[PDB]
């Protein structure tokens, strides 16, 4: 007659010193864990009504401000703290975003600045100090080029040359600028793009698929030498360098305001288009956008690829700054606060996490590119379970109830009439396509990533 | 598999990874620190079932056989015992007047009301500090001090009472016919339910599912559901009226004893009887379901028990007695009956291995080795557990609470797909071609 | 509970064990201490009554104002309730 | 970029290792600064890696004597052939962060392939050293710094203030 209860003998299970923790026994019978479903269900329902409460997207501004509205951002991607901002007055500043004040000012030009773009030189006779000084180029109306020198307190390992080392005078008024990362390189937008040696004071080769005036400039970040053209003409041109050659043309509908390649992949680039929505491409095969982005009501400004590779954020002539990944075709995130307007500038973050962005306004806004992701860095217990939310708020994503709680923003009042407009405007347009669908027989449906091209080269 | 080059490297990544945790939580049965305690005949002469107590409380460990307990209050009526979910602390109930919310294991003593009304059962909440008792006729809200919480306006007779501890949701079914769930974090009644079938003669939960099982004059244990307003499904268990009902933590089987000196073995997941023991010689007033899958059954002064008398085969039909010493047949596991009393509710203790008898004298603990399981989940409930560590999974426990709409009959289908809406998903082609056809 | 943190409290905005909407403020308790009055259930036992009370007003406040039966009859009732001295004035 | 840091101590040198760089866009907010009086996020940060301690207390005068005016001590040069791995002079330094701009150019003098920064982003990281005090070192600094202040402090006046006892 052998019996054996239950003994739990007390000294394993809770701790013989009082500063030990006590030991959390663990037994993983599904048994004993009964509702599998329902919990991770409202933990993610508690992990969208947590997220939609720590909305926090803005951080501040850089300093006090521009005077008449930035209209050019460019980034030190070498520097993690660092911009520079021109001024539609002609003043160029450039900034630490960690102490948020100004380098240096600069009195650049008496007309408007056009593009910034930021590259240490590699003279022929010495070499410019990578880590003393860094190194702004500008872009201007009154048909002018001109180098800045920065003096930057980064480095203690020093202790003249604080601006200007040289001007490029040209013949038409430039549009943009952009720099070419290998060799001293930079190409300018104009009425004619022509490529310059920071050497040379007057510019290599004259690049034109045609005559026609040129609005905005960038390389890409790997095949380094494959240029791409904008054109006020609603078109692309593409440009390589190694042939010294274009290499061919799409044209939309209404005319590109910026572009941005792809750091990651590299061989795809994101456009941005006056007419509200913005565009995104294979190089090889421009007869097929790969995506397009409907989300917005006015003329996209300006659009930047994160260096993640996954997001694009892009700024409006609307008053307000959509995000969203390469796959969803549709803004996650709309930022925008009161006192912007017309954003005609934005760049991603070179660490990939806060959203720069300038506007009309004269202000530098930034922003966090999640609303929820700290500047803190987190315990290991805090990490997991904060991992554990945006992993497990991804295979619930498409409850209704969630998808009415993940989805649904506070935008302005003067945004959601016009797409309240398009709302009705468009199941018009799919009325004017579904009677006359009706009629004719075997009536060709083009698809919507390729209704934004006319014809290609 | 569908051909998509995308989606299959996608999907045979989820399909090896369901595959990779679900061999990994077998990796968790060695770490598994202390087995079920057992009982073996050791003989053919030597019967499991013939061994008393006064056997068992010399062979068993000195800390155990203090945790068996003769609590004789023989002046109040005859109690019901509801012990927490997780195994300390005991609550009583006099039918006359008593109610202790005793700490069990140690010594403490937390609240002891006297009340003259009469009092039919109560249940522990949502922690060891807030219970609430069955009235003479209106359910009361208590707190660990014995002061009073809440008078309940509602629940306008109580005669059985449970709670349900992953919705906050407190139940009552009364002689009123009418079911009612009290969602006490809020305090808002979410769903008063009209049962049509009369006085509520037997309710008991279950775990798996937190639907309710209410039993009634005719027989017909009814499963509920605060959504909707229908019973889930009725099930003629016995004929007669239902004494009690009892239902396993897995989910998966019930056992209901009718006023017709039988008991019902069902199987919910199917809703069919598994085995009917007929003519069980005075009808069990009570039953309950351990932890390791042990039955229990109350003649009213007698106390029995089986092993593996849930399982399907016909070997496993529960039987009063071996002719020959037939192995097939289900021998009673072990017996005890008391000398002059009735019990009105037995439950086990839920993480020791003893079931709480709650008889017209007092109470006794019985001591039974293969009862309880033996290692819990300590993220899930501690019996083992400081202030510190309750407070703080009392308010983890409220942001995780489930809705009350989340009550189906099946747990996993709270995230799948309406059945009326297609199981394929539709193209914009295909709904475009709908249109063609209307 | 635990003074819980300010993001425990935007989700549990609406839980309160202590204080019920059907609890009703706890008038019952709130009175009884006042008047020190012995068992529970007394309080409901009057609350009956005075909400008898307001049921007989109220019907008899739906007769039209000029009726014999409405004037003599809560006049007649209100010597009752003054005799009782549940209410400190007659008029 | 901040990877190795430099605490200097009464009781001898630190170099420390930092594990992860704190985010340097997002510095002044309430939230990185607010991690840097919490223990347990601040390890996260550092991890040490060396400790010498001074061999005396009238050497701890020469060396206190010497960061002073900006200059390298013996062990504070020698510590740092120990830590410091070997890097190129023009391309791909190895940082260190200093809590001085001037004591700077005389490490790269010593050491040409340091590049020693000295911001308000390496500076919150040696601000954060003092906080949490000898909870990082681990017991490795025998005695505390609490006597070590006191006598040092006297010493480095009474050399400057230059009076004899006679």
């Given at each position: 007659?052998?019996?054996?209860?239950?003994?739990?003998?007390?000294?394993?299970?809770?701790?013989?010193?009082?500063?030990?923790?006590?030991?959390?026994?663990?037994?993983?019978?599904?048994?004993?864990?009964?509702?599998?479903?329902?919990?991770?269900?409202?933990?993610?329902?508690?992990?969208?009504?947590?997220?939609?409460?720590?909305?926090?997207?803005?951080?501040?501004?850089?300093?006090?401000?521009?005077?008449?509205?930035?209209?050019?951002?460019?980034?030190?991607?070498?520097?993690?703290?660092?911009?520079?901002?021109?001024?539609?007055?002609?003043?160029?500043?450039?900034?630490?975003?960690?102490?948020?004040?100004?380098?240096?000012?600069?009195?650049?030009?008496?007309?408007?600045?056009?593009?910034?773009?930021?590259?240490?030189?590699?003279?022929?006779?010495?070499?410019?100090?990578?880590?003393?000084?860094?190194?702004?180029?500008?872009?201007?109306?009154?048909?002018?080029?001109?180098?800045?020198?920065?003096?930057?307190?980064?480095?203690?390992?020093?202790?003249?040359?604080?601006?200007?080392?040289?001007?490029?005078?040209?013949?038409?008024?430039?549009?943009?600028?952009?720099?070419?990362?290998?060799?001293?390189?930079?190409?300018?937008?104009?009425?004619?793009?022509?490529?310059?040696?920071?050497?040379?004071?007057?510019?290599?080769?004259?690049?034109?698929?045609?005559?026609?005036?040129?609005?905005?400039?960038?390389?890409?970040?790997?095949?380094?030498?494959?240029?791409?053209?904008?054109?006020?003409?609603?078109?692309?041109?593409?440009?390589?360098?190694?042939?010294?050659?274009?290499?061919?043309?799409?044209?939309?509908?209404?005319?590109?305001?910026?572009?941005?390649?792809?750091?990651?992949?590299?061989?795809?680039?994101?456009?941005?288009?006056?007419?509200?929505?913005?565009?995104?491409?294979?190089?090889?095969?421009?007869?097929?956008?790969?995506?397009?982005?409907?989300?917005?009501?006015?003329?996209?400004?300006?659009?930047?690829?994160?260096?993640?590779?996954?997001?694009?954020?892009?700024?409006?002539?609307?008053?307000?700054?959509?995000?969203?990944?390469?796959?969803?075709?549709?803004?996650?995130?709309?930022?925008?606060?009161?006192?912007?307007?017309?954003?005609?500038?934005?760049?991603?973050?070179?660490?990939?996490?806060?959203?720069?962005?300038?506007?009309?306004?004269?202000?530098?806004?930034?922003?966090?590119?999640?609303?929820?992701?700290?500047?803190?860095?987190?315990?290991?217990?805090?990490?997991?379970?904060?991992?554990?939310?945006?992993?497990?708020?991804?295979?619930?994503?498409?409850?209704?109830?969630?998808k009415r709680i993940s989805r649904h923003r506070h935008v302005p009042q003067v945004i959601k009439k016009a797409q309240e407009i398009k709302n009705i405007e468009l199941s018009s347009i799919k009325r004017r396509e579904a009677n006359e669908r009706r009629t004719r027989k075997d009536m060709p449906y083009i698809s919507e990533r390729k209704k934004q091209i006319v014809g290609t080269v | 598999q569908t051909k998509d080059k995308k989606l299959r490297a996608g999907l045979k990544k989820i399909d090896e990874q369901y595959?990779?945790?679900?061999?990994?939580?077998?990796?968790?049965?060695?770490?598994?620190?202390?087995?079920?305690?057992?009982?073996?005949?050791?003989?053919?002469?030597?019967?499991?079932?013939?061994?008393?107590?006064?056997?068992?409380?010399?062979?068993?460990?000195?800390?155990?056989?203090?945790?068996?307990?003769?609590?004789?209050?023989?002046?109040?009526?005859?109690?019901?015992?509801?012990?927490?979910?997780?195994?300390?602390?005991?609550?009583?109930?006099?039918?006359?007047?008593?109610?202790?919310?005793?700490?069990?294991?140690?010594?403490?003593?937390?609240?002891?009301?006297?009340?003259?009304?009469?009092?039919?059962?109560?249940?522990?909440?949502?922690?060891?500090?807030?219970?609430?008792?069955?009235?003479?006729?209106?359910?009361?809200?208590?707190?660990?001090?014995?002061?009073?919480?809440?008078?309940?306006?509602?629940?306008?007779?109580?005669?059985?009472?449970?709670?349900?501890?992953?919705?906050?949701?407190?139940?009552?079914?009364?002689?009123?016919?009418?079911?009612?769930?009290?969602?006490?974090?809020?305090?808002?009644?979410?769903?008063?339910?009209?049962?049509?079938?009369?006085?509520?003669?037997?309710?008991?939960?279950?775990?798996?599912?937190?639907?309710?099982?209410?039993?009634?004059?005719?027989?017909?244990?009814?499963?509920?559901?605060?959504?909707?307003?229908?019973?889930?499904?009725?099930?003629?268990?016995?004929?007669?009226?239902?004494?009690?009902?009892?239902?396993?933590?897995?989910?998966?089987?019930?056992?209901?004893?009718?006023?017709?000196?039988?008991?019902?073995?069902?199987?919910?997941?199917?809703?069919?009887?598994?085995?009917?023991?007929?003519?069980?010689?005075?009808?069990?007033?009570?039953?309950?379901?351990?932890?390791?899958?042990?039955?229990?059954?109350?003649?009213?002064?007698?106390?029995?028990?089986?092993?593996?008398?849930?399982?399907?085969?016909?070997?496993?039909?529960?039987?009063?007695?071996?002719?020959?010493?037939?192995?097939?047949?289900?021998?009673?596991?072990?017996?005890?009956?008391?000398?002059?009393?009735?019990?009105?509710?037995?439950?086990?203790?839920?993480?020791?291995?003893?079931?709480?008898?709650?008889?017209?004298?007092?109470?006794?603990?019985?001591?039974?080795?293969?009862?309880?399981?033996?290692?819990?989940?300590?993220?899930?409930?501690?019996?083992?557990?400081?202030?510190?560590?309750?407070?703080?999974?009392?308010?983890?426990?409220?942001?995780?609470?489930?809705?009350?709409?989340?009550?189906?009959?099946?747990?996993?289908?709270?995230?799948?797909?309406?059945?009326?809406?297609?199981?394929?998903?539709?193209?914009?082609?295909?709904?475009?071609?709908?249109?063609?056809?209307? | 509970?635990?003074?819980?943190?300010?993001?425990?409290?935007?989700?549990?905005?609406?839980?309160?064990?202590?204080?019920?909407?059907?609890?009703?403020?706890?008038?019952?308790?709130?009175?009884?201490?006042?008047?020190?009055?012995?068992?529970?259930?007394?309080?409901?036992?009057?609350?009956?009554?005075?909400?008898?009370?307001?049921?007989?007003?109220?019907?008899?406040?739906?007769?039209?104002?000029?009726?014999?039966?409405?004037?003599?009859?809560?006049?007649?009732?209100?010597?009752?309730?003054?005799?009782?001295?549940?209410?400190?004035?007659?008029? | 970029?901040?990877?190795?840091?430099?605490?200097?101590?009464?009781?001898?040198?630190?170099?420390?290792?930092?594990?992860?760089?704190?985010?340097?866009?997002?510095?002044?907010?309430?939230?990185?600064?607010?991690?840097?009086?919490?223990?347990?996020?601040?390890?996260?940060?550092?991890?040490?890696?060396?400790?010498?301690?001074?061999?005396?207390?009238?050497?701890?005068?020469?060396?206190?004597?010497?960061?002073?005016?900006?200059?390298?001590?013996?062990?504070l040069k020698a510590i740092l052939d120990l830590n410091l791995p070997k890097a190129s002079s023009k391309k791909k330094n190895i940082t260190l962060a200093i809590s001085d701009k001037n004591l700077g150019p005389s490490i790269k003098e010593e050491f040409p392939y340091v590049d020693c920064i000295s911001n308000e982003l390496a500076q919150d990281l040696i601000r954060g050293v003092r906080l949490h005090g000898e909870k990082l070192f681990k017991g490795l600094q025998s005695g505390d710094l609490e006597r070590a202040?006191?006598?040092?402090?006297?010493?480095?006046?009474?050399?400057?203030?230059?009076?004899?006892?006679?």
């Amino acid at each position: 007659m052998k019996i054996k209860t239950i003994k739990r003998s007390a000294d394993d299970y809770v701790p013989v010193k009082s500063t030990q923790e006590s030991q959390m026994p663990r037994n993983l019978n599904p048994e004993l864990h009964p509702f599998e479903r329902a919990r991770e269900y409202t933990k993610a329902l508690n992990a969208t009504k947590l997220e939609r409460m720590f909305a926090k997207p803005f951080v501040g501004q850089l300093g006090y401000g521009h005077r008449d509205g930035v209209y050019a951002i460019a980034k030190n991607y070498g520097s993690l703290n660092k911009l520079a901002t021109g001024s539609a007055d002609g003043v160029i500043k450039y900034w630490n975003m960690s102490t948020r004040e100004e380098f240096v000012s600069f009195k650049a030009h008496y007309g408007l600045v056009t593009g910034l773009c930021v590259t240490q030189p590699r003279f022929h006779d010495k070499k410019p100090d990578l880590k003393s000084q860094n190194f702004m180029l500008s872009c201007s109306d009154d048909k002018t080029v001109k180098l800045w020198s920065i003096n930057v307190d980064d480095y203690s390992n020093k202790n003249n040359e604080e601006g200007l080392i040289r001007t490029f005078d040209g013949e038409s008024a430039f549009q943009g600028i952009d720099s070419h990362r290998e060799n001293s390189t930079f190409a300018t937008g104009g009425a004619k793009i022509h490529l310059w040696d920071v050497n040379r004071l007057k510019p290599v080769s004259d690049l034109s698929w045609g005559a026609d005036n040129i609005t905005s400039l960038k390389f890409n970040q790997n095949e380094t030498d494959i240029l791409a053209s904008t054109g006020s003409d609603n078109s692309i041109v593409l440009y390589d360098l190694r042939t010294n050659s274009p290499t061919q043309k799409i044209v939309q509908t209404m005319r590109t305001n910026a572009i941005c390649w792809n750091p990651m992949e590299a061989f795809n680039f994101v456009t941005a288009n006056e007419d509200h929505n913005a565009y995104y491409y294979d190089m090889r095969n421009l007869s097929r956008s790969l995506n397009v982005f409907k989300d917005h009501v006015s003329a996209v400004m300006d659009v930047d690829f994160s260096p993640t590779g996954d997001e694009i954020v892009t700024g409006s002539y609307d008053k307000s700054i959509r995000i969203y990944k390469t796959n969803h075709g549709h803004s996650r995130e709309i930022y925008h606060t009161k006192r912007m307007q017309h954003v005609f500038q934005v760049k991603y973050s070179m660490d990939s996490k806060y959203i720069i962005s300038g506007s009309d306004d004269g202000n530098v806004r930034l922003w966090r590119s999640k609303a929820w992701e700290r500047s803190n860095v987190k315990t290991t217990r805090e990490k997991n379970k904060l991992e554990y939310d945006e992993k497990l708020k991804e295979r619930f994503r498409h409850m209704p109830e969630i998808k009415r709680i993940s989805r649904h923003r506070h935008v302005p009042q003067v945004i959601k009439k016009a797409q309240e407009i398009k709302n009705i405007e468009l199941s018009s347009i799919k009325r004017r396509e579904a009677n006359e669908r009706r009629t004719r027989k075997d009536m060709p449906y083009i698809s919507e990533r390729k209704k934004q091209i006319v014809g290609t080269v | 598999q569908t051909k998509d080059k995308k989606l299959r490297a996608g999907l045979k990544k989820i399909d090896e990874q369901y595959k990779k945790a679900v061999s990994s939580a077998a990796a968790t049965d060695y770490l598994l620190p202390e087995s079920n305690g057992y009982l073996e005949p050791e003989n053919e002469l030597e019967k499991t079932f013939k061994v008393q107590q006064s056997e068992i409380k010399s062979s068993v460990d000195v800390s155990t056989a203090n945790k068996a307990l003769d609590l004789s209050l023989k002046e109040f009526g005859p109690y019901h015992i509801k012990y927490a979910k997780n195994g300390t602390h005991l609550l009583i109930t006099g039918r006359k007047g008593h109610v202790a919310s005793m700490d069990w294991r140690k010594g403490q003593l937390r609240a002891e009301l006297f009340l003259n009304e009469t009092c039919h059962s109560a249940t522990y909440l949502q922690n060891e500090q807030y219970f609430a008792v069955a009235q003479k006729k209106y359910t009361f809200i208590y707190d660990h001090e014995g002061t009073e919480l809440h008078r309940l306006k509602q629940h306008i007779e109580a005669r059985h009472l449970d709670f349900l501890p992953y919705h906050y949701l407190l139940v009552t079914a009364g002689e009123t016919g009418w079911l009612k769930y009290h969602d006490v974090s809020t305090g808002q009644l979410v769903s008063e339910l009209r049962t049509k079938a009369g006085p509520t003669m037997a309710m008991a939960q279950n775990p798996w599912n937190a639907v309710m099982h209410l039993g009634h004059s005719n027989g017909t244990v009814s499963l509920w559901s605060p959504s909707m307003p229908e019973p889930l499904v009725k099930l003629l268990s016995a004929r007669g009226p239902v004494n009690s009902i009892a239902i396993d933590r897995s989910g998966y089987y019930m056992a209901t004893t009718g006023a017709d000196r039988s008991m019902k073995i069902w199987d919910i997941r199917n809703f069919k009887q598994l085995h009917s023991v007929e003519s069980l010689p005075t009808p069990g007033t009570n039953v309950s379901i351990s932890d390791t899958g042990l039955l229990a059954l109350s003649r009213g002064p007698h106390v029995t028990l089986w092993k593996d008398a849930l399982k399907l085969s016909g070997d496993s039909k529960p039987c009063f007695g071996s002719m020959g010493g037939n192995p097939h047949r289900n021998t009673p596991y072990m017996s005890h009956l008391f000398a002059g009393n009735k019990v009105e509710n037995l439950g086990f203790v839920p993480f020791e291995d003893l079931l709480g008898v709650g008889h017209q004298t007092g109470i006794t603990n019985l001591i039974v080795p293969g009862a309880g399981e033996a290692n819990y989940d300590a993220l899930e409930l501690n019996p083992f557990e400081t202030k510190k560590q309750r407070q703080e999974q009392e308010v983890r426990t409220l942001l995780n609470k489930l809705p009350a709409d989340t009550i189906t009959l099946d747990p996993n289908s709270i995230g799948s797909v309406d059945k009326r809406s297609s199981t394929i998903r539709l193209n914009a082609k295909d709904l475009a071609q709908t249109t063609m056809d209307a | 509970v635990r003074k819980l943190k300010h993001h425990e409290q935007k989700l549990l905005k609406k839980v309160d064990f202590l204080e019920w909407k059907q609890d009703q403020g706890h008038r019952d308790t709130q009175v009884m201490r006042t008047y020190h009055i012995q068992n529970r259930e007394d309080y409901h036992k009057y609350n009956r009554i005075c909400g008898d009370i307001r049921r007989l007003a109220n019907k008899l406040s739906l007769l039209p104002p000029t009726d014999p039966f409405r004037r003599k009859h809560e006049q007649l009732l209100l010597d009752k309730l003054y005799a009782m001295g549940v209410l400190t004035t007659k008029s | 970029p901040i990877e190795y840091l430099l605490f200097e101590e009464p009781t001898g040198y630190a170099v420390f290792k930092v594990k992860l760089q704190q985010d340097d866009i997002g510095s002044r907010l309430k939230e990185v600064q607010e991690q840097i009086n919490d223990f347990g996020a601040f390890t996260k940060l550092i991890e040490l890696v060396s400790f010498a301690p001074f061999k005396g207390a009238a050497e701890a005068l020469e060396n206190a004597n010497d960061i002073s005016e900006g200059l390298v001590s013996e062990s504070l040069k020698a510590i740092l052939d120990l830590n410091l791995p070997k890097a190129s002079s023009k391309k791909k330094n190895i940082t260190l962060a200093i809590s001085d701009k001037n004591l700077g150019p005389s490490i790269k003098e010593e050491f040409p392939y340091v590049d020693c920064i000295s911001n308000e982003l390496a500076q919150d990281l040696i601000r954060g050293v003092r906080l949490h005090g000898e909870k990082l070192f681990k017991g490795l600094q025998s005695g505390d710094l609490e006597r070590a202040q006191l006598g040092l402090g006297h010493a480095y006046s009474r050399a400057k203030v230059k009076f004899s006892v006679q």
